Structure formats: C-alpha cells, structure tokens
Design a protein around this motif. Sequence first.
Motif, PDB file in Angstrom:
ATOM      1  N   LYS A   1      -5.520   7.565   2.023  1.00 47.89           N
ATOM      2  CA  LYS A   1      -4.537   6.724   2.699  1.00 47.89           C
ATOM      3  C   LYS A   1      -4.880   5.261   2.477  1.00 47.89           C
ATOM      4  CE  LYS A   1      -3.476   9.622   6.745  1.00 47.89           C
ATOM      5  NZ  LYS A   1      -3.702   9.524   8.216  1.00 47.89           N
ATOM      6  N   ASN A   2      -3.892   4.390   2.676  1.00 48.63           N
ATOM      7  CA  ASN A   2      -4.085   2.948   2.530  1.00 48.63           C
ATOM      8  C   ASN A   2      -4.677   2.538   1.191  1.00 48.63           C
ATOM      9  OD1 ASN A   2      -3.056   1.495   4.785  1.00 48.63           O
ATOM     10  ND2 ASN A   2      -4.701   2.322   6.069  1.00 48.63           N
TER      11      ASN A   2
ATOM     12  N   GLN B   1       0.792  -1.228   0.000  1.00 45.83           N
ATOM     13  CA  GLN B   1       0.000   0.000   0.000  1.00 45.83           C
ATOM     14  C   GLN B   1       0.829   1.286   0.000  1.00 45.83           C
ATOM     15  OE1 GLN B   1      -2.644  -1.136   3.544  1.00 45.83           O
ATOM     16  NE2 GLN B   1      -4.149  -0.845   1.897  1.00 45.83           N
TER      17      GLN B   1
HETATM   18  C1  NAG Z   1      -4.020   1.950   7.278  1.00 45.24           C
HETATM   19  O1  NAG Z   1      -3.885   0.455   7.229  1.00 45.24           O
HETATM   20  C2  NAG Z   1      -3.349  -0.170   8.402  1.00 45.24           C
HETATM   21  C3  NAG Z   1      -3.264  -1.658   8.110  1.00 45.24           C
HETATM   22  O2  NAG Z   1      -2.553  -1.933   6.900  1.00 45.24           O
HETATM   23  C4  NAG Z   1      -4.262   0.152   9.573  1.00 45.24           C
HETATM   24  O3  NAG Z   1      -3.797  -0.528  10.738  1.00 45.24           O
HETATM   25  C5  NAG Z   1      -4.299   1.663   9.778  1.00 45.24           C
HETATM   26  O4  NAG Z   1      -5.138   1.989  10.886  1.00 45.24           O
HETATM   27  C6  NAG Z   1      -4.831   2.362   8.523  1.00 45.24           C
HETATM   28  N1  NAG Z   1      -4.805   3.809   8.697  1.00 45.24           N
HETATM   29  C7  NAG Z   1      -5.693   4.636   8.116  1.00 45.24           C
HETATM   30  C8  NAG Z   1      -5.509   6.118   8.396  1.00 45.24           C
HETATM   31  O5  NAG Z   1      -6.616   4.209   7.393  1.00 45.24           O
END
Ligand code: NAG
Lengths: 325, 325, 325, 164, 164, 164
Positions: free
Chosen positions: A22-23, A15
């Motif tokens: 994000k993500n 990712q």
């Molecule tokens: C992004 O993904 C991770 C897992 O890959 C997760 O633990 C995290 O909370 C996520 N953060 C957001 C801002 O979505």
Amino acid sequence: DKICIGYHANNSTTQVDTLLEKNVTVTHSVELLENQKEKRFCKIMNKAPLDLKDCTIEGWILGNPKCDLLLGDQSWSYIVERPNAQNGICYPGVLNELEELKAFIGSGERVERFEMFPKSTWAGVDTSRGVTNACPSYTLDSSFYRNLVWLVKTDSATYPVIKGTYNNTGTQPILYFWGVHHPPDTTVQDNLYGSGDKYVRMGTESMNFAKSPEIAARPAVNGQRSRIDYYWSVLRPGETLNVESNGNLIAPWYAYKFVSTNKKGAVFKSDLPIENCDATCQTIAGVLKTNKTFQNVSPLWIGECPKYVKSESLRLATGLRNVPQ
Amino acid sequence: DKICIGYHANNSTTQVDTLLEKNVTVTHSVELLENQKEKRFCKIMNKAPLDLKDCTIEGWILGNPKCDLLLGDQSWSYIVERPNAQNGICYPGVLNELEELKAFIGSGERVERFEMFPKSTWAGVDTSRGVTNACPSYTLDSSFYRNLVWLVKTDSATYPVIKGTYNNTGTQPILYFWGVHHPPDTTVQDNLYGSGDKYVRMGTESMNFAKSPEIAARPAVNGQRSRIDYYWSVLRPGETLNVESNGNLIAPWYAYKFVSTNKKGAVFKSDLPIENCDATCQTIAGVLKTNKTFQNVSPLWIGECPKYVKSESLRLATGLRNVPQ
Amino acid sequence: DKICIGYHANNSTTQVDTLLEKNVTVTHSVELLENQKEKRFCKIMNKAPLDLKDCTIEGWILGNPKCDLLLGDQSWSYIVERPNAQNGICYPGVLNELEELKAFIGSGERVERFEMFPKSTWAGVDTSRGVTNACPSYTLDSSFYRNLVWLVKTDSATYPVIKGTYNNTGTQPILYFWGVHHPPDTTVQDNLYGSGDKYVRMGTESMNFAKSPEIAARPAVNGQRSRIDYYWSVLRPGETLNVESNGNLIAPWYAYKFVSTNKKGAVFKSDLPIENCDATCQTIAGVLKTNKTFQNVSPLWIGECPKYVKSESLRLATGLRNVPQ
Amino acid sequence: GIFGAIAGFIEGGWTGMIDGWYGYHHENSQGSGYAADRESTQKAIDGITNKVNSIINKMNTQFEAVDHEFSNLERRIGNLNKRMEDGFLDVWTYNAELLVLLENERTLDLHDANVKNLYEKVKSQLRDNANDLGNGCFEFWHKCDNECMESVKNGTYDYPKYQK
Amino acid sequence: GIFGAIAGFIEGGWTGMIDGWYGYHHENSQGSGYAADRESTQKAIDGITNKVNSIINKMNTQFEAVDHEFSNLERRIGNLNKRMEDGFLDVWTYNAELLVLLENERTLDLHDANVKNLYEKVKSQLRDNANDLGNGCFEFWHKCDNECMESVKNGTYDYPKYQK
Amino acid sequence: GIFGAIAGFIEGGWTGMIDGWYGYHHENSQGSGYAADRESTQKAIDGITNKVNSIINKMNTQFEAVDHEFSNLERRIGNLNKRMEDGFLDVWTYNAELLVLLENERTLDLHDANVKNLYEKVKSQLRDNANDLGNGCFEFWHKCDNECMESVKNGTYDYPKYQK
Ligand SMILES: *[C@@H]1O[C@H](CO)[C@@H](O)[C@H](O)[C@H]1NC(C)=O
Ligand SMILES: CC(=O)N[C@@H]1[C@@H](O)[C@H](O[C@@H]2O[C@H](CO)[C@H](O)[C@H](O[C@]3(C(=O)O)C[C@H](O)[C@@H](NC(C)=O)[C@H]([C@H](O)[C@H](O)CO)O3)[C@H]2O)[C@@H](CO)O[C@H]1O
Ligand SMILES: CC(=O)N[C@@H]1[C@@H](O)[C@H](O[C@@H]2O[C@H](CO)[C@H](O)[C@H](O[C@]3(C(=O)O)C[C@H](O)[C@@H](NC(C)=O)[C@H]([C@H](O)[C@H](O)CO)O3)[C@H]2O)[C@@H](CO)O[C@H]1O
Ligand SMILES: CC(=O)N[C@@H]1[C@@H](O)[C@H](O[C@@H]2O[C@H](CO)[C@H](O)[C@H](O[C@]3(C(=O)O)C[C@H](O)[C@@H](NC(C)=O)[C@H]([C@H](O)[C@H](O)CO)O3)[C@H]2O)[C@@H](CO)O[C@H]1O
Ligand SMILES: *[C@@H]1O[C@H](CO)[C@@H](O[C@@H]2O[C@H](CO)[C@@H](O)[C@H](O)[C@H]2NC(C)=O)[C@H](O)[C@H]1NC(C)=O
Ligand SMILES: *[C@@H]1O[C@H](CO)[C@@H](O[C@@H]2O[C@H](CO)[C@@H](O)[C@H](O)[C@H]2NC(C)=O)[C@H](O)[C@H]1NC(C)=O
Ligand SMILES: *[C@@H]1O[C@H](CO)[C@@H](O[C@@H]2O[C@H](CO)[C@@H](O)[C@H](O)[C@H]2NC(C)=O)[C@H](O)[C@H]1NC(C)=O
Ligand SMILES: *[C@@H]1O[C@H](CO)[C@@H](O)[C@H](O)[C@H]1NC(C)=O
Ligand SMILES: *[C@@H]1O[C@H](CO)[C@@H](O)[C@H](O)[C@H]1NC(C)=O
Ligand SMILES: *[C@@H]1O[C@H](CO)[C@@H](O)[C@H](O)[C@H]1NC(C)=O
Ligand SMILES: *[C@@H]1O[C@H](CO)[C@@H](O)[C@H](O)[C@H]1NC(C)=O
Ligand SMILES: *[C@@H]1O[C@H](CO)[C@@H](O)[C@H](O)[C@H]1NC(C)=O
C-alpha cells in the motif's frame, strides 16, 4: 568513458496500492472513478423534467384543484416529486394498485389531457352538485377533482341507470380513472343515491369490473367519515369502454392520452432545484459530467452514467515506481 | 562445432488477445465458446416435446373444440407454443391467475384427461343446451369446451340448487377448471337461470370460493356481450371437492391428472420445426451439440447447456507466440 | 572456503493448488474457510430466541388454547418453529396474507399482549357461548382462541348492529386479528346470527374492509364443515379503528403491541436444541465460532457471519514450496 | 521489483530524463547527457494504453437500480429487490477494487522487467569492451565518441572492432 | 517477452522443430538436426493442460433464465426479473472476457520464462568450453560428437574433461 | 519456478535454516552454520501479509438469503428468489476458488524470484574472488573469516581488497 542504464522519475507524489504494497508513489497514474457532482436537475436529450412542486403524483393525475398549475398537457425526460408535497388525494380513500400506476407513469414521456365523458353522458341525474369541503380550490372552500365527476340523484326523484361509451379509435392508449363512493351510514346513502341495492360496472374487450358500496362509519379524515375507492386503467388503441351504474359512481370525466417510452424512465423523490442547464447523465443526487468509468454518487440515474460502485478511489498505475533522489 | 537454444513455430495464423496486446498469432490455442446451433426442436431424454400447433395453452387445457387434436393424454419433455396460434379462449372472458397456471403447467411432465363430474351430477337442470356460436367445432357452428359444461335451467321451471362431490382418493394431484357466467342484462339472466339472487361456491380442505354474477353490458367480442370468469385449481391427493350452485355455473366436466417434474421445465414460444432427432441440450433458438464451456446462442434452454454469455470469441492460448521466418 | 544461497523447508505436508499445479506441498499456508459448527441455537446480543415448541406461528399469534405456554409478552433475538408442531389454526379456515404476516413478525423483536376490545364493547349479544370442539384446551373439549371472540345472537332475539372503537394514542403499532364465519347452510346461519343479509366492516385512517358470508358446505375438517376467514392488520400510532357488524363477526379481543427491529430478523424451521450458551453468529444449521472469511455450513443466518460459499477448502499459500531432502 | 532492477541494484531514478520511461546517461569526451530508449518506451506505452483501454472496455456495463415502490403487503418482494441491488453492487465493487490492486502489482513488475531486459540487451552487446560495475553502469576500456554511443543505442554495436 | 527470450534476443522460431515446444539445433561433424527438450516441454504441457481444465471446471455452473410471463399489473416484478437476468449475464460475460485476456498474457510470459530458463540451464553447464554469441547459440572450442551433445541434453555434461 | 531457482538449479531446501525463508550456509575455518537474510525475508513477509489482509478485506461482504415463504400462487416470485440466491452463491464461489488458485501460483513465483534475486545480489558483489558452481554455492579463492562473511551478508563486501 562510460554509459549507464536507468529509468524515469519526477515531482509526482501520487500514490497507488497493490496486493503486496500500500502507499506506493508512482510517476504516472489515472483515476477511473468520479466523485464530483452538481447538486441540481438538468435537461436530458434537450428535454426538461416535470416538477410536481407541491403536488404528489396522485394529486397531479387525479386533477386535485390545487394542482391546476400542472393541468393540461405535459412532456418530460423524467419526473421530480417533492419530499413534502401537500396536495394528493384530498377526499379520503385508496387508489387501488397505486404502485403499479406510479411504475406505469414512470414509463412515460407525455400526456394529453382530454374530455372523455361530458356530463351530458349521464342522463337524468345531477352532474353539478358534486363538491366537498375536503377538496377546496385556491378560490372556493368546496370543489372536487378536475378529472372526475360526482354524480348525485336529481333533486327529488330516484337514481336511474346511467350509461357511457368511449370507443378508442385513435392510435394511443388512454389512462383514465373512476371511483366508488363508500358512505358512512344508510341515511347518507339514501340522501345521495336513494334506496335499493346499488352497483358500478365497467367493461372493455380485455377488462371488466363490478363493485357495490361498502357502507360503514370510518374515522374522520379531512372531516369526512366516508371513503372513495379510486381506480385507474388503460384503454388500448382499438378497445372501447362501457360504463354502467345505478348509484355511487364517481364517473370519469377527463382522461389522458399516454405516450410509452420503451426506455427506462425515472421518478425522483428529491428537493434539488431544477435549473436551465444540460446534461447527459442525471442521478437523483446530482449531475455527472465525466469521461470516467466508475462513480460513487448514486445507483439511481437516467441517461448514460458510469457504473456505480462503493469505492473511494480506483487509481490505476501506468508509469513506474517513483524513486527520485 | 556449436549448439543452439530455441522454440517451436508453424503454419498457424490463429490469433488471441492479451491485456497488453491484441491480435497476437500463436502456435496452439483453444476456443471455449460455441456459436453454432441447429434451428430445430429435438427430443430430450429420448422424450418428445408437445407441439400445441394452432392452439394456445389456454385453448389446449380448456378443451377448445378446434384443439381436439390435443385432446386426451399427453407427455412431454417440454412445450412449444406457436407465435400466432389462433385457438385459445373462444367465449370472451378472463382466465384468473393465467400466468401462474402457465408456470404450473410448465413444471409438468404429463396429463391424463378424465371425467370428474358426469352431467348426471347436476340434478334438475339442462346439461344438453350449453352451446354458443362463439365456440364452433370444425363440424358445427355452435359448440362449447370439452372440459366444461354450461348448465341452464330446464325448459320451464326454475334453477334448483345443484351439488357435486369428487373425493381424490388417488395418488396424483388434479388440475381442473370452472367458470362464472356474467350476462349482459337482466332478461338474459332470467332467460337462462331464472330470477332471484344467484351464487357459485366451491369447497376443499384447503380452499374455498364464492362468487355471484357481475351483470353488465360489455363491448362485443366474438359476437358476445357476455363474459365468463374462468378459474383453475389443483385438488391434492387426499383432498375432496364440493360444488354448489343455484345459477350461472360453468361446471367442471373433464379434468386432468397431473405429474409434477420437480426439475426446471420449459415452455417455448417459437416457430422452429420439431424434427425426429435427439439432443442433450435444447435452447429456444436451436440445439447445441458441443463439449465447449460457453455459448452465445440463447439464455433460455432445457437440458445440459454451456453457460450463456455475450462474447463473440473466448479464445485461450496454450502454445507460445508464433514467430516463423 | 565457501558460501551457499538457499531457502527454508520443514516437516509440513500441508498442500495447496495452483492454476498450473494441483497437490503442491508448502511450508506455511492459511485456511480461509470454516466448516465446523455446533449443532445448537444460542443467544444473540445476550438475548435468547423464541421456541414455539409444539405451536406454529399461527397457533401462537392467534392464541390457540394449547399454545398458552406462549401467551403474554415475548422478546426474541430470533424465532424457532419446530418442523412438526401440531397446534396452529384449529378451526378450519384461511389466514389471509399469511406469508406477509410471517415476514412482518420475522421483522420483530417483542410483543406485548393486551386487551383491545372487552366483551362489553359488543352490546346486545352473547359473548359467552363462542366455543367449539375443534378448539379444545388441555382442560376442556370445547374452547376457542384467546385473542378472538365468537359473537352469537342472544338466546332469543335477533342480531343487533354492534360497534367498537380503539384509538391508538400510544407510540407503538398494534398487530391485531379478526375473522368472518362462513357457515355450511342456511339453518346454521339462522341458528347463530338470525336471518337477513349480514356484513362485517372495519375502518381506519388508511384501511377499510367489508365482507359478507360465503355460505356453502365444505369437506369436514376437524369435524367442521364451516370455515373461518382470518385477517390481520397493523393499527399505526395515531390511527384509530372502527368495528361494525350485524352478524358473523369473530371479533378481536386481545392484540399485540409490536416492536419493529429495522435489522434483518430470522425465523428458523429446525429441530436443533436451544441451549443456554452465547454466540455472535447463528446459522439455521448451527453456531459458527470463527475468525475465518468463508464458510460452507449455511446461507441462512442471523448475526455476523462469514460469506457462505460452496467450496470444500480455500487454502492460501504464504510460504514457499517445500523441498526437504 | 521481482526482476531486481528498479529500486534494486539500480537504486534510484533520474529526474534528468524527461523524454521517456527507460533510457541512457552516457559519459564521454564531448560531454554527457540523458536520452531515452524510444523503442522499449513506446512498447511499454502501447502495451499499457492497451491494458487501460481493455479494462475500461470490459467495465462498460451498468447494473441499474429502480425507483419502484412497494406497499405494506409487498414487504417480501421489496426486500427481494433490495437484496438484489445490494448484491450486484457488492460484486461490482469487489471486482473493481481487486482488479485495480492486482493490475497495479503486475504493471510495476512489467516496468521492472523492461528495465532489467534493456540492461541485458546492452551487456549482451558489450561483453569484453567494458566493465560491469553491478549498479547498471558500464565503464569502457576503449574510447567511445558520439557515433560510437549511438551504435550501442540503435543496437548496431560492432564488438570485433573494439575488442583489440 | 518480459524474460527477454521469445522474439527478443532469440529473434524467431524454428518451424523445423515439430516434436516439442522448446528444444535444440546442434551442429557437428556427423551432421545437424533438430530435437526438442521433452522434459521442460512435458512440464509446460502438464501445467497448461492443468490451467485449461481448472478454468473449464470453475466455469461449470449456469445461471438459468425462465420463460415466466407477467401480467399488465405485474410490470414491477417483471422488470425486477429482467434486471436480474441481465445483471448476472453481465457479470459472467465480464468474468469470462477478462479472465481470458489476463490468462493469455500470463501463459505467454510462462512460455518465455521456460525458454530463458532452458538457455540458462545450458550456459550454466558449459561455462568456458564454449562461446556465447548472445543470440542463444553456443560455439564450442573443443569437439562435440553425438554422445557429447547427448550428455548436454540429458544434463550430464562433464565440464572437467573438456576444460583443458 | 519460472525464475529457475527453487527446485531448479538450487535443487532443494535446508530444514536447517529455521529463522527465515531465504538465507545462507557459509563454510570456513571457524566452522559453518545457517543464517537467514532477515531483510528480504521481512520484505516477503510484509508483502504477503499485505496480500492476505487485502484478500480478506475485499471479501468482507455477505449476500444474505432469507427464510421468506411463498404461497401456491406465488410459484413465480419464489423461483425468482431461488434463482437469485443460487446465482449470487455461484459467482462468489467462483470468485473465491479462482482467486485462490491464481494467487497461490503468483505467490510461489514471488518466492522463487526473491531467491533468484538474492543469488544475483551476491554474485554481483563477488565477481572474481570466487567460483560459481552453478548450484548456488560460491567457492572462495581467498580466505574468509566471520567479519569477512558478515560483510557479504550486510552487503558491504569490499571487492578491491581481496581481488589481488
Ligand atoms: C497511506 O498513506 C496515508 C497518507 O498519504 C496515510 O495517512 C495512511 O495511514 C497510509 N496507510 C497505510 C495502510 O499505510
Ligand atoms: C362530530 C361529528 O362527527 N359530526 C359529523 C359531521 O361533521 C358530518 O357532517 C359532515 O361534516 C363535514 C365536515 O367537514 C362536511 O361538512 C360534510 O359536508 C359535505 C362535504 O362538504 O363534503 C357537503 C357536501 O356537499 C356533500 N357532498 C355532496 C356531493 O353532496 C358531502 C357528503 O354529503 C358527504 O361527504 C358524504 O360523505 O358532505 C358533512 O356531511 C355528519 C354527516 O353525517 O356526521 C356527523 O356525525
Ligand atoms: C346489434 C347487437 O348488438 N345485437 C345483439 C345481438 O347480437 C344479441 O344476440 C346474440 O348474438 C350473438 C351473435 O353472434 C349470438 O347469436 C347469441 O346467441 C347465443 C350464442 O350462440 O352464443 C345462442 C346460444 O344458444 C345462447 N346460449 C345458451 C347456452 O343458451 C347464447 C346466450 O343466450 C348468450 O351468449 C348469453 O351471453 O347466445 C345471441 O344471444 C342480443 C342478445 O341480447 O343482443 C343484441 O343487442
Ligand atoms: C355426518 C355428518 O356430516 N354430520 C354432521 C354433524 O357432524 C354436524 O354437527 C356438528 O358436528 C361437529 C362434530 O365435531 C360438532 O359437534 C359441531 O358442534 C359445534 C362445535 O363444537 O363446533 C357446537 C358449538 O357450540 C357450535 N358453536 C357455537 C359457537 O354455537 C358449533 C357451530 O354450531 C358449528 O361449528 C357451525 O360451524 O358446532 C356440530 O355442529 C351437523 C351440523 O350441521 O351436520 C351434520 O351433517
Ligand atoms: C384519538 O385521540 C386523540 C386524543 O388524544 C384525539 O385528538 C384530538 O383531535 C381533535 C381534532 O380531531 C383536536 O381538536 C383535539 O384537541 C385533540 N385532542 C387530543 C388530546 O389529542 C383524536 O382526534 C382521536 N381521534 C379519534 C378518531 O378517536
Ligand atoms: C368502434 O369504432 C369502429 C369505427 O371505426 C367500429 O368499426 C366497425 O366494426 C364493424 C364490426 O364490428 C365493421 O363491420 C365496420 O365496418 C367497422 N367500421 C369502422 C369504420 O371501423 C367498431 O366496431 C366500434 N366498436 C364499438 C364497440 O364501438
Ligand atoms: C374420502 O374417501 C375416503 C375413503 O377411502 C374416506 O376415508 C374415511 O374417513 C373416515 C373418517 O373421516 C374414516 O373413519 C374411514 O375409516 C375412512 N375410510 C377409508 C376407506 O378411507 C374420507 O373420509 C372421504 N372424505 C370425504 C370428504 O369424502
Ligand atoms: C485485429 O485483426 C483483424 C484482422 O485479423 C483486424 O481486422 C482488426 O482491425 C484488428 N484489431 C486491432 C484492435 O488491432
Ligand atoms: C491430490 O492428493 C490427494 C492426496 O493428498 C489424492 O488423493 C488426490 O487424488 C490428488 N489429486 C490430484 C488431482 O492429483
Ligand atoms: C545507427 O546510427 C547511425 C547514426 O549515428 C545511423 O546512420 C545508422 O544508420 C543507424 N543504424 C541503425 C541500424 O540503427
Ligand atoms: C545420458 O545419455 C547416454 C546416451 O548418450 C545414456 O546412456 C546415459 O545413461 C544418460 N544419462 C542420463 C543421466 O541422462
Ligand atoms: C556490517 O558488519 C559489521 C560487523 O561484522 C558491522 O560493524 C558494520 O557496521 C556493518 N555495516 C553495514 C553497513 O551493515
């Protein structure tokens, strides 16, 4: 009969982030940031660092008798001082301009220890009784620095004026040291150097120096209430030094021919082991073996290192958004 | 009957780069970066710089006799020192806090030389025999600095205490200089200033100064084994200075009324010729005559210059991609 | 029958800029930059600052008699010095290393005034006649500093050697002060301390000090032609101090137990009133109460403040272009 | 995507196509199969290799901290040094993180637009001889063998011929 | 281009058109000739003059090195100064070079989109009364003189009239 | 807009629609009324909240000036300090102002493209069953009640049914 337009996808779960999102899983990306290091000190330009071990820089360069392991010539890519090294300045006093001396030695590559003033230089005085139990070697309870000599009046008479010259006819600058002894009371002053006003003076083409004793009683340090003011300088190629004193002179004896690097130079305070490996980039925290652009290990390094940065990841998307199904 | 939609093209072969594509020819662009300079020093604010010529800043300000070309008043937009200027400090010694003096003079615009202590100030001593072959003028083998005076005991008697006062009742700060003579042995000390402990002291509202001689033999420099410790200070408007000495005083004689700029100020070490032209931007490397935003000539300038930068080109596309055919 | 596609609009006249277009009205935006402040000094971490009022830092810490309002213990989140405070160093002299002392006190949080050397420490001398009309209290025309004591020979005899010790067996570093009196002539020197060469010396484990008088006549300041050289130091936990003098000693009397902050620390030169309010961000210009990212009030602050910046506005568009009709 | 294509009207992606980023899935009497459009792929690849190498190149300087020590009376210049080193550290950290975010956004938008434009490239060729489903698939009215499909692929599709 | 137009489906450019960036090449019974769309041209021109002047404006500060000298025992503060000057030099060099690259990319994309959108502007007007070749030329079914062409140009093309 | 939509072929905006950024104004036998497309709205909203929070986050450091004083013989290090503080001030001012300008530009372009893509989303569904005016309004040939309109809105418009 038909035909469809579409795009790549795959098993990737790697990712990235964007300003909007994000993500976000993508097909192909690249990581620009290194976070992996080898906790050790290796060679630079196939040249090994200097381990001071149980000596501080002061104790090394002044020739503390318990630092005799380091005595003589040394060459280094960089310097490693140990956090709790015990041997530095044994006889209580101050090294004047210590920080600038540390910086200067930092900017170096090599020293050649040589004898600059034989004890014969000093005429009509005792060059053989300069010892203290503040400065023991591993073989006797009363010695002194290997690079300095404690001149004391001959076992009866008074302290004559004494004189020394060294003309630096060579091509290298010379690092050297001397001192002024500050006694705790009048009677010790007299027992060592006799009565009358005393001075220590030193001249070169581009430096002069005068100082008298500063007699007073100080707190006991290594069982001494006396002090010594230590001093260091560099005799440039072509310059020549005149030494003149009628008392209280801790005279230079050995000195160093110094090689200036013109490059950066590093002195690392650390406890990491020095191992017989190679490296092209060396932080205080460890070695980096990378082709990456960034790193988050340490801002302090010698050699060719990636740009230090506080980021955890710096992941850059190259492929498109992954949408398998 | 028909109609077509399309775009401009032309004879242009000017190229730019993008994140995606290098070497991309476009119709119209603009270059934001200047790389052209005139290798010379011109006037700033219709005011001409100071050419020290064969004098160093020290030699100029102390009044070295071979720097008499510069004697008297001077005004400047900036200062030009020549790389291998020969005339500076003729009689061997150190100018204390030299770098800060250079910075201070850098921050200036004008000096007015005036007489601060006539030789009559010093009573019962010889103000006329202060000369050395270390400091020749272009007309005799033994002179001294124009702004200092070497006081010596009258041809028999001893050195009396001597005293001087200057009350700065004017609106301008005064830059001034003095010295302490450090002789090579006791007999010279006695031949010049007679016996007994000697001092030099100076007081103002916000500064005091005391120093004694530091007698020792130093390496020969311009045939002298003696030294002089040179000192400089600024008497502020309202302040007044007391001079008191019983020996070894190189007394202030002439001094300067100084005009502080409050702007940046520059001292250029360079060999470029100063020509009678004008300029609104002046680097150490040359003049820039531009309306452009960036430059890659030099980071050191006086006046209004473009932002220095390491780039070769900073070409910005304004027209579209060129596709003639 | 029909259906249309379109977008939002509203009564908004709020504008933004883009690289392509200035003055562009949009539906919703946000301002990232604070420009509003409360011109006052408030508490930080529920802790109130120190108002020096009509005292300078020097006058406060040396114990100037007109600064008795500040005498004793003090605790602060930050320090406020007033632009034209009148009470500082009353008896003319220099505080050596003043700037570093100001920085050190800046890095503090609290001082505990205590007595370090009772007048009894000094044996065979007069500890009760040390006063001058340069240093009046609000109740007599001749006093002296509360934290220093002016030792003078007993009304007949000569000045004996005097000695003092303080062993810092506590867990806190001690800030303390002393001085050397520089008289204007030989006869005053003799009237106060008697004849013979005089010295002042001080020793600790990691510091020593020697100085003699620098007797000369200086311009009148607060009716004094004498000077005092003031000195300050820090006795670390474990260290102990030896005082030894045979003349001209302005002896330490009271001193301070000091608490180092390890955080930033601020000393504000300003005339703003200190009010009994609270704050989480405090500039020299005023208080900011914001949740915004940027600010253009001041670069100097204590506490948690937005990033200082020169911009007038930093307006960020979030909604779309407004096109009502 | 802002060009509507990726995870838009083309709702997902083909793990089948393993030889390019963008391409085709034809369907006719000889069979089907995947095949990537090597041209616009190699274009994207070159442009994005360029982006990455330009980014690495511009980032090829290092601010360099030093082990220099400062005495008890050098608190001020010590602090000055610290503030400088942290300062520069802060701006380079910011530049890096921000640039990464932004550039990722625009990279994705690039892929999206390249897809959209390939779709357009096709539709522009086949205008009446097929049926636009609207999910980026095209249904022929006539017959298309392999030398037929190929001509669409290498952009030389003769519309006159099959229009009757 | 990401909008597909410049060096895309419109494969090249007219050195003929010397009075604008974007425009027209009509073809009818009175003759042909080139003529630029002054509106979207002047729009582009103003927007891009704006970009350039904003860039120059934001870049109107100079970090300023100094000739200050340092003694042999001032090695540390000397080095501190050098590191500072080089530091700032590095970040401004980076900012400039990077900004230039990026902005050029987006400028070109802007030109491309302006072209594409002009094409769309036209096609939207003429819907049935012409034939879209797909290379950005339109072939009329009816007759178009000069007062006819002109009405397309100044955007007031009456589609009802010519639809029969 | 570079996607041609906002203040383009859709010449203006509806102060009527007060429950979203992008949406609809239907017109049929039961009446008319406005209603926003909550999906692409909430998408824009999340993306742009993200932009703003990322910008605030990256900007969460402060260079910190100091009240330190310098004597008359410390002119050099004093000036060094000043130049440092002003320096950093200059680069952060630049970063902020520039980033704001750029980001505003791209935000607006984003809104524009989202509109354009909604329009496309619709047109793609209704292909023959309506008449594209070209100003982003669609005129039905058949009848559309409320359960009809709704099916267009929630994207489940059955084209077969109404094609006859
Ligand atoms: C992004 O993904 C991770 C897992 O890959 C997760 O633990 C995290 O909370 C996520 N953060 C957001 C801002 O979505
Ligand atoms: C209770 C108390 O304070 N007693 C001290 C007493 O300790 C001190 O004698 C000194 O004690 C130390 C203790 O470690 C050493 O024994 C000193 O000896 C030497 C030394 O080894 O350093 C002998 C040495 O040969 C001498 N050096 C030379 C070159 O001659 C030196 C030298 O005299 C001194 O170092 C001068 O600093 O000392 C021993 O002197 C006495 C001394 O006055 O004072 C009591 O109060
Ligand atoms: C082999 C050796 O070392 N011989 C030296 C011998 O040279 C030296 O005499 C000094 O030699 C220099 C050589 O250039 C000058 O001749 C010195 O002369 C003057 C001077 O010109 O500077 C004369 C001058 O009038 C004197 N100045 C005043 C104001 O009286 C000065 C002054 O006495 C000295 O500068 C003091 O620094 O010198 C000449 O003295 C002698 C001196 O001891 O020593 C031999 O060993
Ligand atoms: C015209 C001229 O210059 N006359 C001076 C004359 O003023 C000066 O006498 C000094 O004058 C000042 C004026 O404010 C004070 O009166 C000095 O008095 C004290 C003082 O108050 O400071 C008295 C004080 O008790 C003394 N302190 C102690 C601890 O004994 C001090 C002390 O003697 C001096 O401060 C030493 O610095 O002075 C008074 O001395 C005389 C002095 O020589 O000189 C004339 O030329
Ligand atoms: C300062 O005070 C402490 C007292 O707490 C002294 O500590 C002693 O030091 C000697 C050796 O120097 C030890 O053998 C004692 O056992 C210690 N006792 C205690 C109680 O600490 C310290 O030495 C004193 N130093 C001076 C210079 O006064
Ligand atoms: C240091 O050594 C060199 C010897 O190499 C000395 O050089 C001589 O200097 C004098 C003048 O000062 C010349 O006339 C000689 O011809 C030089 N000879 C050589 C061989 O260099 C130098 O002067 C010495 N200086 C001191 C102070 O010892
Ligand atoms: C320097 O010169 C001025 C003369 O202008 C002196 O000023 C006098 O100061 C006294 C008090 O110190 C006043 O009472 C006089 O009225 C002042 N007169 C004038 C004309 O200013 C100043 O004191 C002098 N100081 C020294 C040390 O010489
Ligand atoms: C860009 O063009 C120049 C000639 O104009 C050429 O010499 C250079 O190698 C090219 N560089 C790249 C990266 O294409
Ligand atoms: C922008 O708008 C303000 C009024 O809101 C106006 O005064 C100003 O001159 C305008 N500036 C530009 C560059 O258009
Ligand atoms: C297109 O494809 C055929 C093979 O099916 C090939 O022979 C022909 O030359 C190609 N032409 C172009 C222009 O790609
Ligand atoms: C369009 O062109 C004609 C000239 O051919 C002109 O008279 C007419 O007023 C123009 N109208 C608009 C709206 O541009
Ligand atoms: C669409 O709208 C109808 C209501 O008019 C609803 O019942 C139906 O389930 C919706 N389906 C989807 C896929 O949105």
